[PDB]
Design an enzyme around this catalytic site. Structure first.
Site, PDB file in Angstrom:
ATOM      1  N   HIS A   1       1.189  53.515 -35.260  1.00  0.00           N
ATOM      2  CA  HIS A   1      -0.149  53.051 -34.763  1.00  0.00           C
ATOM      3  C   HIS A   1      -1.046  54.160 -34.102  1.00  0.00           C
ATOM      4  O   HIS A   1      -1.491  54.061 -32.929  1.00  0.00           O
ATOM      5  CB  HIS A   1      -0.002  51.816 -33.849  1.00  0.00           C
TER       6      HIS A   1
ATOM      7  N   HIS B   1      -3.437  55.803 -39.116  1.00  0.00           N
ATOM      8  CA  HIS B   1      -3.464  54.387 -39.452  1.00  0.00           C
ATOM      9  C   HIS B   1      -4.876  53.809 -39.241  1.00  0.00           C
ATOM     10  O   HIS B   1      -5.377  53.072 -40.086  1.00  0.00           O
ATOM     11  CB  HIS B   1      -2.336  53.647 -38.711  1.00  0.00           C
TER      12      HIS B   1
ATOM     13  N   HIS C   1      -9.477  49.532 -34.002  1.00  0.00           N
ATOM     14  CA  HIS C   1      -8.612  48.352 -33.950  1.00  0.00           C
ATOM     15  C   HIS C   1      -7.292  48.492 -33.158  1.00  0.00           C
ATOM     16  O   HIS C   1      -6.824  47.526 -32.516  1.00  0.00           O
ATOM     17  CB  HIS C   1      -8.404  47.796 -35.384  1.00  0.00           C
ATOM     18  N   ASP C   2      -6.702  49.688 -33.203  1.00  0.00           N
ATOM     19  CA  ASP C   2      -5.478  49.953 -32.470  1.00  0.00           C
ATOM     20  C   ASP C   2      -5.619  51.049 -31.421  1.00  0.00           C
ATOM     21  O   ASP C   2      -4.696  51.858 -31.236  1.00  0.00           O
ATOM     22  CB  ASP C   2      -4.323  50.258 -33.425  1.00  0.00           C
TER      23      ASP C   2
ATOM     24  N   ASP D   1      -5.104  45.952 -42.408  1.00  0.00           N
ATOM     25  CA  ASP D   1      -4.104  46.444 -41.464  1.00  0.00           C
ATOM     26  C   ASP D   1      -2.749  46.766 -42.124  1.00  0.00           C
ATOM     27  O   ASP D   1      -2.021  47.670 -41.677  1.00  0.00           O
ATOM     28  CB  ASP D   1      -3.907  45.373 -40.381  1.00  0.00           C
TER      29      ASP D   1
ATOM     30  N   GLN E   1      11.785  44.143 -46.028  1.00  0.00           N
ATOM     31  CA  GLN E   1      10.530  44.422 -46.691  1.00  0.00           C
ATOM     32  C   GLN E   1      10.192  43.362 -47.766  1.00  0.00           C
ATOM     33  O   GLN E   1       9.055  42.887 -47.866  1.00  0.00           O
ATOM     34  CB  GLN E   1      10.609  45.810 -47.310  1.00  0.00           C
TER      35      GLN E   1
HETATM   36  C1  LIG Z   1      15.824  44.189 -41.162  1.00  0.00           C
HETATM   37  C2  LIG Z   1      14.418  43.729 -41.223  1.00  0.00           C
HETATM   38  C3  LIG Z   1      14.146  42.385 -41.066  1.00  0.00           C
HETATM   39  C4  LIG Z   1      12.875  41.846 -41.103  1.00  0.00           C
HETATM   40  C5  LIG Z   1      11.898  42.794 -41.318  1.00  0.00           C
HETATM   41  C6  LIG Z   1      12.152  44.140 -41.483  1.00  0.00           C
HETATM   42  C7  LIG Z   1      13.428  44.653 -41.440  1.00  0.00           C
HETATM   43  N1  LIG Z   1      10.994  44.811 -41.688  1.00  0.00           N
HETATM   44  C8  LIG Z   1      10.037  43.910 -41.654  1.00  0.00           C
HETATM   45  C9  LIG Z   1       8.600  44.191 -41.835  1.00  0.00           C
HETATM   46  C10 LIG Z   1       8.358  45.684 -41.742  1.00  0.00           C
HETATM   47  C11 LIG Z   1       6.972  46.023 -42.038  1.00  0.00           C
HETATM   48  N2  LIG Z   1       6.555  46.698 -43.086  1.00  0.00           N
HETATM   49  C12 LIG Z   1       5.193  46.778 -42.953  1.00  0.00           C
HETATM   50  C13 LIG Z   1       4.405  47.485 -43.966  1.00  0.00           C
HETATM   51  C14 LIG Z   1       4.783  46.132 -41.809  1.00  0.00           C
HETATM   52  N3  LIG Z   1       3.581  45.929 -41.222  1.00  0.00           N
HETATM   53  C15 LIG Z   1       3.603  45.263 -40.109  1.00  0.00           C
HETATM   54  C16 LIG Z   1       4.800  44.709 -39.427  1.00  0.00           C
HETATM   55  C17 LIG Z   1       5.954  44.954 -40.052  1.00  0.00           C
HETATM   56  N4  LIG Z   1       5.929  45.659 -41.228  1.00  0.00           N
HETATM   57  N5  LIG Z   1      10.540  42.661 -41.424  1.00  0.00           N
HETATM   58  C18 LIG Z   1       9.902  41.428 -41.584  1.00  0.00           C
HETATM   59  C19 LIG Z   1      10.216  40.633 -42.669  1.00  0.00           C
HETATM   60  C20 LIG Z   1       9.633  39.391 -42.809  1.00  0.00           C
HETATM   61  C21 LIG Z   1       8.722  38.956 -41.869  1.00  0.00           C
HETATM   62  C22 LIG Z   1       8.400  39.771 -40.796  1.00  0.00           C
HETATM   63  C23 LIG Z   1       8.998  41.009 -40.637  1.00  0.00           C
HETATM   64 MG   LIG Z   2      -2.523  46.415 -33.723  1.00  0.00          MG
HETATM   65 ZN   LIG Z   3      -2.993  47.990 -36.931  1.00  0.00          ZN
END
Ligand SMILES: Cc1ccc2c(c1)nc(CCc1nc(C)c3ncccn13)n2-c1ccccc1
Ligand SMILES: [Mg+2]
Ligand SMILES: [Zn+2]
Length: 324
Positions: A79, A83, A117-118, A228, A280
């Site tokens: 962040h 970004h 934004h951040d 975002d 992911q």
């Molecule tokens: C073991 C593990 C478990 C869950 C995980 C994870 C790793 N990783 C993520 C999401 C990771 C991620 N990748 C980008 C591009 C993002 N942007 C914003 C916030 C999170 N973000 N979740 C997840 C998956 C589903 C919903 C919310 C978060």
């Molecule tokens: Mg933010």
């Molecule tokens: Zn952001």
């Protein structure tokens, strides 16, 4: 409590000319600012120029502002400065491809809002800040970081020769603040699932109405969410890396929780490097695809965003199934 820019930095911003080759690539939704750090501030300028006219802003003021904003992002893995501009860039390509849906008042408000934004993100979640038990979370109880980000934006404009929205009337002035306020509030992901639920709903019941403001507001909020996370809409080699940045933040938040005897949630737990691909995939399906799917539906020209998310998604599938 703010941080400005040496006269050197800003004046050289005005000198900046975007190289002729990056002109058609910049218009692409999937364009990657990554290789061009020297240019990031100057890329934001060019987009201002190309979106809303060569001079909605007085160069010097804009440049001062842009550079002062830079100086207010921290040096954390995700962040940070990169970004903010990446988010800026996606709003740009959105706005351009929807040339007449938006007002000059919105388009400059929105490009500014993404940049800011951040602001002064520390690299902690709202959760981590409220869950124990920060002065920022002591101040703003919900949407902890996003209110700080807007107040940070606020204090930057209130500065000497930084108020790039000066020439506007005080009605038009505190109106863009309202665009920017809600713009920045929207990137609290927590709030997005509701917003998308409601928009999902309106589009079906032939009820969604760009005339109505809190419909506009919702449409925009979705655009802010979508910007975002546009990490997930870049060509795969760019999406692999921008993820590595994201986990080095989370896992640095997980560590500060392990240091206390507390299991962090697995997204922020480095003892789960291999659980990531799966996570992911979950994220694409639970958060990303809906976001872009609903954006595409309301704004069809933004389809290339869904196209590219899908492309990455199945890339992530391939990693899980063991190939690539
Ligand atoms: C073991 C593990 C478990 C869950 C995980 C994870 C790793 N990783 C993520 C999401 C990771 C991620 N990748 C980008 C591009 C993002 N942007 C914003 C916030 C999170 N973000 N979740 C997840 C998956 C589903 C919903 C919310 C978060
Ligand atoms: Mg933010
Ligand atoms: Zn952001």
């Amino acid at each position: 409590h703010m941080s400005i820019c040496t006269s050197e930095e800003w004046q050289g911003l005005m000198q900046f000319t975007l190289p002729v080759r990056l002109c058609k690539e910049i218009e692409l939704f999937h364009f990657d600012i990554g290789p061009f750090e020297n240019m990031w501030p100057g890329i934001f300028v060019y987009m201002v120029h190309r979106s809303c006219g060569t001079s909605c802003f007085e160069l010097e003021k804009l440049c001062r502002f842009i550079m002062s904003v830079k100086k207010n992002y921290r040096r954390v893995p995700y962040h940070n400065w990169k970004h903010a501009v990446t988010v800026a860039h996606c709003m740009y390509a959105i706005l351009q491809n929807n040339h007449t849906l938006f007002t000059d008042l919105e388009r400059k408000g929105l490009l500014i809002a993404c940049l800011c934004h951040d602001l002064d993100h520390r690299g902690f979640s709202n959760s981590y800040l409220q869950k124990f038990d920060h002065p920022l979370a002591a101040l703003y109880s919900t949407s902890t970081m996003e209110q700080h980000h807007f107040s940070q934006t606020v204090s930057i404009l209130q500065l000497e020769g930084h108020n790039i929205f000066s020439t506007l009337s005080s009605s038009e002035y505190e109106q863009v603040l309202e665009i920017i306020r809600k713009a920045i509030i929207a990137t609290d992901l927590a709030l997005y699932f509701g917003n998308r639920k409601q928009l999902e709903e309106m589009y079906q019941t032939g009820s969604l109405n760009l005339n109505n403001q809190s419909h506009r507001d919702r449409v925009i909020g979705l655009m802010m969410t979508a910007c975002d996370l546009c990490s997930v809409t870049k060509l795969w080699p760019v999406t692999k890396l921008t993820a590595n940045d994201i986990y080095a933040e989370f896992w640095a938040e997980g560590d500060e929780m392990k240091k206390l005897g507390i299991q962090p949630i697995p997204m922020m737990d480095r003892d789960k490097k291999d659980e990531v691909p799966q996570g992911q995939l979950g994220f694409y399906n639970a958060v990303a695809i809906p976001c872009y799917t609903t954006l595409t539906q309301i704004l069809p020209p933004t389809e290339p965003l869904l196209k590219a998310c899908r492309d990455n998604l199945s890339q992530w599938e391939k990693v899980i199934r063991g190939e690539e």
